[PDB]
Amino acid sequence: MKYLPQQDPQVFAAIEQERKRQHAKIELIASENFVSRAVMEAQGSVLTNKFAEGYPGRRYYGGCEYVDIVEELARERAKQLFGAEHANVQPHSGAQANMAVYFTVLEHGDTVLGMNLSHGGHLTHGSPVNFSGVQYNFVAYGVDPETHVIDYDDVREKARLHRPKLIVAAASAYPRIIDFAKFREIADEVGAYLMVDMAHIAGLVAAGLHPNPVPYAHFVTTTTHKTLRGPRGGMILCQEQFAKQIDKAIFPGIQGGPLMHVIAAKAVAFGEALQDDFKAYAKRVVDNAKRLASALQNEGFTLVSGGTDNHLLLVDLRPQQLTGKTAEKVLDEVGITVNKNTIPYDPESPFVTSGIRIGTAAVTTRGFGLEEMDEIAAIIGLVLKNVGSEQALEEARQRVAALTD
Amino acid sequence: MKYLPQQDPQVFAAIEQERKRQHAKIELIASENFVSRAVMEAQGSVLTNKFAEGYPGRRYYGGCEYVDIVEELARERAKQLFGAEHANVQPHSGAQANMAVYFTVLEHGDTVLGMNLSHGGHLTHGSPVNFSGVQYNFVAYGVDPETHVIDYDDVREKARLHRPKLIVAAASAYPRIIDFAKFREIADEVGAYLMVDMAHIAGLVAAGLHPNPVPYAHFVTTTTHKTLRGPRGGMILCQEQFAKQIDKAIFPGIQGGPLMHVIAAKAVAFGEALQDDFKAYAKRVVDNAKRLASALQNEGFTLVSGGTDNHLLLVDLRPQQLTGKTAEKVLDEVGITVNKNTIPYDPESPFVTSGIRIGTAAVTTRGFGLEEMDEIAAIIGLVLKNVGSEQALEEARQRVAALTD
Ligand SMILES: *Cc1c(COP(=O)(O)O)cnc(C)c1O
Numbered sequence: 079m080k081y082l083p084q085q086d087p088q089v090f091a092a093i094e095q096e097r098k099r100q101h102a103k104i105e106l107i108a109s110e111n112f113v114s115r116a117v118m119e120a121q122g123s124v125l126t127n128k129f130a131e132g133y134p135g136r137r138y139y140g141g142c143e144y145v146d147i148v149e150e151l152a153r154e155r156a157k158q159l160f161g162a163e164h165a166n167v168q169p170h171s172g173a174q175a176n177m178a179v180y181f182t183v184l185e186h187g188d189t190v191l192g193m194n195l196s197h198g199g200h201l202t203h204g205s206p207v208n209f210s211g212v213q214y215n216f217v218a219y220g221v222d223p224e225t226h227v228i229d230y231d232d233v234r235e236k237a238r239l240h241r242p243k244l245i246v247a248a249a250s251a252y253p254r255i256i257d258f259a260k261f262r263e264i265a266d267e268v269g270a271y272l273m274v275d276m277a278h279i280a281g282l283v284a285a286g287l288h289p290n291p292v293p294y295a296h297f298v299t300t301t302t303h304k305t306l307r308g309p310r311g312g313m314i315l316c317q318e319q320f321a322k323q324i325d326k327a328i329f330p331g332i333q334g335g336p337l338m339h340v341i342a343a344k345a346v347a348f349g350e351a352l353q354d355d356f357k358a359y360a361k362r363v364v365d366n367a368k369r370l371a372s373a374l375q376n377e378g379f380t381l382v383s384g385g386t387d388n389h390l391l392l393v394d395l396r397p398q399q400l401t402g403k404t405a406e407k408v409l410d411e412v413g414i415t416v417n418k419n420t421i422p423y424d425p426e427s428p429f430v431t432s433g434i435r436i437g438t439a440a441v442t443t444r445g446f447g448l449e450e451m452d453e454i455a456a457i458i459g460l461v462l463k464n465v466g467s468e469q470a471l472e473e474a475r476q477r478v479a480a481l482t483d
Numbered sequence: 484m485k486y487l488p489q490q491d492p493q494v495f496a497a498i499e500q501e502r503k504r505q506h507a508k509i510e511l512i513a514s515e516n517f518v519s520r521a522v523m524e525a526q527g528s529v530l531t532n533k534f535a536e537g538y539p540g541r542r543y544y545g546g547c548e549y550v551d552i553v554e555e556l557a558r559e560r561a562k563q564l565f566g567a568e569h570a571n572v573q574p575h576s577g578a579q580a581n582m583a584v585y586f587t588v589l590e591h592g593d594t595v596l597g598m599n600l601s602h603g604g605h606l607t608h609g610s611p612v613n614f615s616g617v618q619y620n621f622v623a624y625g626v627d628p629e630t631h632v633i634d635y636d637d638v639r640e641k642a643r644l645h646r647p648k649l650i651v652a653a654a655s656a657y658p659r660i661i662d663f664a665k666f667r668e669i670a671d672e673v674g675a676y677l678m679v680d681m682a683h684i685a686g687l688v689a690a691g692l693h694p695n696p697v698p699y700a701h702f703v704t705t706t707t708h709k710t711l712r713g714p715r716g717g718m719i720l721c722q723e724q725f726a727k728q729i730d731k732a733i734f735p736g737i738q739g740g741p742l743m744h745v746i747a748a749k750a751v752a753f754g755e756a757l758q759d760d761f762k763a764y765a766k767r768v769v770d771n772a773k774r775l776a777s778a779l780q781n782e783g784f785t786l787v788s789g790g791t792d793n794h795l796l797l798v799d800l801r802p803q804q805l806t807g808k809t810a811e812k813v814l815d816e817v818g819i820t821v822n823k824n825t826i827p828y829d830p831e832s833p834f835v836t837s838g839i840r841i842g843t844a845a846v847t848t849r850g851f852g853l854e855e856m857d858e859i860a861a862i863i864g865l866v867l868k869n870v871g872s873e874q875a876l877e878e879a880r881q882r883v884a885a886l887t888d
């Protein structure tokens with residue numbers, strides 16, 4: 079940086095602390111990643127200066143010839159990546175992408191069927207403290223109490239009983255592949271739209287490592303960050319039949335001016351995801367997750383669903399008589415970043431939990447492989463088995479430091 | 484830029500076109516500005532990598548010690564600038580800031596009183612194609628048909644008749660000072676909350692050149708871009724009594740993860756606005772607007788309200804028998820960027836209009852002064868009086884080129 083350090087010492091000092099933190103810590107929060115310098119440069123561009131309400135070639139303000147090229151690059155590359163008939167790259171966030179789809183197809187009070195939030199569903203899939211559960215009538219389907227896999231018969235029974243106008247599939251804490259064909263079959267049976275929120279798994283979908291929801295869903299929402307490794311923001315994919323409505327829901331429905339610099343960054347990240355090396359990256363993410371899962375089981379830990387099909391795993395800490403909160407706190411002391419997470423049928427509150435959620439996307443981006451996964455598992459074992467031993471925690475701290483160099 | 488040009492030639496080429504466009508054109512769109520290199524550097528930072536749901540010292544994820552410092556810098560500086568009891572710097576946009584306030588105090592179907600959209604009100608103040616008019620029952624107050632000043636007796640009569648739960652003041656196309664004391668008096672009479680959306684005038688408010696809504700309003704919403712000259716995004720200011728509710732409305736109510744890099748950029752822009760030279764800048768904005776207004780009147784143009792108290796003016800093109808659409812198009816041909824804008828009681832549709840809206844914030848940022856205002860007025864006169872003369876338009880083009888160098 080050249081201008082920020084002189085203009086704003088306080089902000090610069092805090093940014094520099096954050097940069098050093100990102101390097102020093104082991105980032106295992108499953109939604110986290112590190113974007114490329116190219117992506118950041120696009121976000122740091124003069125495109126922040128442009129008001130571009132509307133869409134490419136159909137803007138409400140003049141002077142948009144070049145931002146149109148950028149937005150179209152983002153839309154076309156997204157269509158290449160995911161095979162969707164239409165893309166909308168303007169959502170400010172995953173939350174706003176979801177908001178717009180709900181705005182498109184639902185009226186206030188309509189019934190919507192989503193994944194149980196305590197079983198892996200997202201806040202925007204019907205939390206009573208979120209606009210989703212306040213604005214619409216959410217009902218929930220669950221995972222099996224033993225296998226922790228979505229119970230598709232439960233999805234079906236809930237859909238037939240409650241007659242939702244919309245069914246939502248996808249999750250922020252579900253470690254197995256989701257069967258979109260089955261969701262669509264159930265949707266079809268009850269005459270419901272199907273929305274898939276692929277935010278967590280979008281990079282995996284792009285790399286052909288998770289089945290693609292696009293062919294099965296009327297609407298697919300996503301973040302551009304997370305496994306897709308782009309800037310923070312949202313995107314909607316859909317069939318051409320809903321394109322006009324989706325575009326209108328975003329603007330003038332729920333947003334104003336788009337963030338053209340972030341859209342530039344989205345185009346860049348989509349460019350990166352189209353490359354062969356991104357596919358290799360994503361395979362290493364899933365390989366690392368599988369390895370870390372097996373290594374954790376070797377250390378004596380129980381995993382929700384007994385492992386993982388994707389980038390993420392959930393540790394059921396009940397056998398160790400620990401809460402997620404305790405584990406998260408002690409791991410923080412040694413430089414490992416996880417989050418407490420409810421496990422299915424958790425006897426604890428969402429503020430305490432019986433679990434921790436772990437993902438490999440971030441550590442894979444920094445070049446960690448199988449050997450590093452074994453060592454991360456060994457460190458986690460050392461820490462969680464010796465929570466009252468400062469000797470053990472210092473050893474962990476040193477081993478964490480060895481990994482991040 | 485160092486990495487973007489190699490990684491993504493297509494995106495880089497389009498960005499470079501946009502950068503050159505920003506320099507070559509005369510930007511008169513009243514909401515536009517140019518941010519500092521420091522602001523852009525903050526937006527281009529590694530803070531995009533951080534998930535920070537929640538608030539400083541009350542986050543739902545670990546590792547937020549440094550982004551907390553950044554967000555608190557933004558909140559404290561905003562409180563210094565505007566004298567508010569509480570700031571929320573997380574809204575992704577002006578639209579989301581408004582969305583959150585509505586979410587805080589209103590139920591679906593509640594009556595809200597806002598400025599007539601054709602008289603200067605914003606899309607988010609009750610457009611039937613926007614979430615505001617779909618979700619709530621909007622009624623409108625108007626400006627006087629002659630003076631084009633808000634009719635405060637109309638505000639009062641509408642409030643007494645319709646009994647709104649919320650009254651909204653502020654505008655995207657209103658060239659005079661808004662009397663917040665009078666709005667609050669009317670709000671008090673009918674037991675309505677008062678919300679002021681100061682997006683357009685926020686930089687002027689910060690510089691003491693427009694009366695501050697904070698002392699009079701329960702809630703103040705704003706963009707951080709526009710006259711405030713920050714990155715694109717939103718902010719909510721409010722009394723401490725509503726702080727908890729406002730924070731909860733933003734998250735977990737309407738958004739997910741905040742954009743911490745944009746929040747850094749917000750802190751930077753607030754730092755800049757606190758400086759003496761920003762105050763001098765803002766005075767030049769208003770001085771330039773007054774000068775440009777008078778110079779346009781000298782060229783024979785009629786202005787809505789007969790002039791301006793702020794950064795913006797509206798030309799009533801009816802005396803020249805032109806639509807806003809025609810004027811906007813021809814000005815675009817010579818390198819002057821305006822927008823068509825409805826004038827109060829416009830006989831034309833919002834897609835055609837009888838007006839153009841013009842603001843001086845952007846040209847002032849690039850160092851234009853009174854002499855430049857006279858010349859911009861002279862060029863606009865030359866063009867709009869000779870729409871069928873290619874000779875005249877080429878002369879205009881050359882004079883525009885002389886100004887931008
Ligand atoms: C992260 C996430 C979101 C929300 O994205 P934000 O950008 O944080 O609003 C929505 N759905 C799922 C499944 C997510 O993981």
Ligand SMILES: *Cc1c(COP(=O)(O)O)cnc(C)c1O
Pocket residue numbers: 333334335514575576577578579581605607653654655680681682683706715716717
């Ligand atoms: C620009 C504006 C908004 C919306 O801000 P976005 O960031 O474009 O959503 C809201 N209110 C007023 C008065 C505005 O001028």
